[PDB]
Symmetry: C3
Subunit: 114 residues, 3 copies
């Protein structure tokens, strides 16, 4: 998978080790090798959630497979947990968009995964 | 819905109250409660539209339902109108990508909307 | 099409002509006039790829048509080639997500392409 977080929380509030923690937690949650996992954190963003500029986050998880009703609930618990714990963002001010990608629609190293 | 706009217009050109207006107008357009609407504005971007660096924007609207032929035309008129009037971006230099999300693929508050 | 690249490469390492080069090369690759094509480059990002913070890129290509198994394999070579030469990114540290958009879900100039 690849995971992206966009947040209005300032850069300094992102803990050293946060990217590594996301990488390892996603490897465990998906059973994928950490070697292929990509993570991306974007702080200091100009955002509102419900018209409020309190801490919030907009996220996405793209994966080839391993996306579904029950799996997505488990990811959401895991990822909101991390965002609460590490960035002090309330879970009800987080959206996570899940994308089940066709392998032919993911390019890597001069080809696709198909 | 969640609405993201990326633009090369500088931050100083984003008027006070713009995120509030987007929230309010998207609530009216979709009939959804403003309390659930998220908005994200990213100025000062390195962008080109048709090989020109004149003011432009690339946007996305994700919604669970409320996405379709006529609805999307109505959203485009609204949102291009706002980008023109408030950010001084010509409508012919705006793209907006619309996404109809399955509730099972949207995480929020430690769970998903499924 | 529209092309977005997010990268941890610093802004000063992004050549001034990169957006125009991408525009022109994509126009040739897709058979579309360059005036239609939009490009967005986001440097200085906090990213990890396989647990490493060496230069990397996460990209997307959206297009109305011109997306499919063979076409995507070809785009991947084109884009890995440009990112490798101009941004000095190893091609095995690039992901490109491909999206085939419905014309009714792409807004432009107060309307949609449908
Ligand atoms: C997890 S193993 N990610 C690496 C493969 C991948 C899957 C989905 C997308 O969009 C990019 C890369
Ligand atoms: C508008 S009411 N948004 C809240 C629900 C939602 C819909 C779609 C996505 O991607 C996130 C959240
Ligand atoms: C290439 S000709 N792009 C212009 C039309 C377009 C296609 C797809 C998306 O997402 C935006 C614009
Ligand atoms: Cl699976
Ligand atoms: Cl086609």
């Amino acid at each position: 998978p690849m995971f992206i977080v966009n947040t209005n929380v300032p850069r300094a509030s992102v803990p050293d080790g946060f990217l590594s923690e996301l990488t390892q937690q996603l490897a465990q949650a998906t059973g994928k090798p950490p070697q292929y996992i990509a993570v991306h954190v974007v702080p200091d963003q100009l955002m509102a959630f419900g018209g409020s500029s309190e801490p919030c986050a907009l996220c996405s998880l793209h994966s080839i497979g391993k996306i579904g009703g029950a799996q997505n609930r488990s990811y959401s618990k895991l990822l909101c947990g991390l965002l609460a714990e590490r960035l002090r963002i309330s879970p009800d001010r987080v959206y996570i968009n899940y994308y089940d990608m066709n392998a032919a629609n993911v390019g890597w190293n001069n080809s696709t995964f198909a």
